[PDB]
Write a protein that binds this ligand. Structure first.
Ligand SMILES: NC(=O)c1ccc[n+]([C@@H]2O[C@H](COP(=O)([O-])OP(=O)(O)OC[C@H]3O[C@@H](n4cnc5c(N)ncnc54)[C@H](OP(=O)(O)O)[C@@H]3O)[C@@H](O)[C@H]2O)c1
Length: 315
């Protein structure tokens, strides 16, 4: 539809606006335009370093009465340097301050990896490697569950968890709140059929991040594949008189995924909204799926020997 049902009874807008890499001085206007255009779901994160400026736009549209607060679906995520039981509430409350809300709709564990606490997002040792916390996924999940019981967040979820990491929360003794959502990377070059099949079979909603292949990721190099300019995908968009981005956004939606394309450009924020009015044939969907090449934009490459690195498992 336009919203999917979560295991807590709330409904989550199938389209949201991503805000990673959105400069603090453009994102306020970006979020204001999104909300005006009809977006009702914004994907945030403390590590983005722009939640204060996202929060300025949200407050403005609330006070303008363009939207009521219960119409909005705001998501953020707990960064890896706050996995300690004693740090989780404090990280949540900081995010709530910057965003200027009194609760979140969904709050995700950003990565399954815990890092040493401190002021660096990626703490390094003598030899320049990332310093891990000795915390585990289950301790952190218990801290998250508390935030539901105190009324700070309505739902809790995970991001970049492999199927065995999800299983481990699912089999936790005394598990009180199931993960509502697993936000993972997903597009025609990394189609994630096994992990999406698993999560959907557990009643867990999947959100596809980097739908367009994150052409603005910091580590981009030119040999790299570009979805937005794949001549095969352009042909499919030509056939529907749509843009290739509009096709890349409609693709997850028809797999019953939530999708969160990022833009700070007003015409593109608008273009990206115009995806509810057409449909890919099953032939187009199969063709799109056949393009997989197991290519990840985000492989958290500095943590490949972390005890909790998610991407050594098949899925
Ligand atoms: N949970 C995680 O670990 C994680 C990791 C990565 C991403 N995410 C979430 O997923 C969101 C989306 O992922 P992403 O930011 O990597 O990349 P993306 O959404 O795949 O691509 C964003 C890039 O595509 C461009 N773009 C937007 N609309 C376009 C259009 N219609 N035509 C051409 N180009 C277009 C943007 O340009 P302009 O802004 O220049 O318009 C920006 O350069 C993030 O912002 C974040 O909120 C989460």
């Amino acid at each position: 539809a336009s919203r999917l049902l979560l295991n807590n009874g709330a409904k989550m807008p199938i389209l949201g606006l991503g805000t990673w890499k959105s400069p603090p001085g453009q994102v306020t206007e970006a979020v204001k335009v999104a909300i005006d255009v009809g977006y009702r779901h914004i994907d945030c994160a403390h590590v983005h370093q722009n939640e204060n400026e996202v929060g300025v736009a949200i407050q403005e549209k609330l006070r303008e009465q363009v939207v009521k607060r219960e119409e909005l679906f705001i998501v953020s995520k707990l960064w890896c340097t706050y996995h300690e039981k004693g740090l989780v509430k404090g990280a949540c409350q900081k995010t709530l301050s910057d965003l200027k809300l009194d609760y979140l709709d969904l709050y995700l564990i950003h990565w399954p990896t815990g890092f040493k606490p401190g002021k660096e997002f990626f703490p390094l040792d003598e030899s320049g490697n990332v310093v891990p916390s000795d915390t585990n996924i289950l301790d952190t999940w218990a801290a998250m569950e508390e935030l539901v019981d105190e009324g700070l967040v309505k739902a809790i979820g995970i991001s970049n968890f492999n199927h065995l990491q999800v299983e481990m929360i699912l089999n936790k003794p005394g598990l009180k709140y199931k993960p509502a959502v697993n936000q993972i990377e997903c597009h025609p070059y990394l189609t994630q059929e096994k992990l999406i099949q698993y999560c959907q079979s557990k009643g867990i909603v999947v959100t596809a991040y980097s739908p367009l292949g994150s052409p603005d990721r910091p580590w981009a190099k030119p040999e790299d594949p570009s979805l937005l300019e794949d001549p095969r995908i352009k042909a499919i968009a030509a056939k529907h008189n749509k843009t290739t981005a509009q096709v890349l956004i409609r693709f997850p939606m028809q797999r019953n995924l939530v999708v969160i394309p990022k833009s700070v450009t007003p015409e593109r924020i608008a273009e990206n909204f115009k995806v509810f009015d057409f449909e890919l044939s099953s032939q187009d969907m199969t063709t799109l799926l056949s393009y997989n090449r197991n290519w990840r934009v985000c492989a958290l490459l500095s943590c490949t020997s972390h005890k909790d690195y998610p991407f050594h498992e098949e899925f």
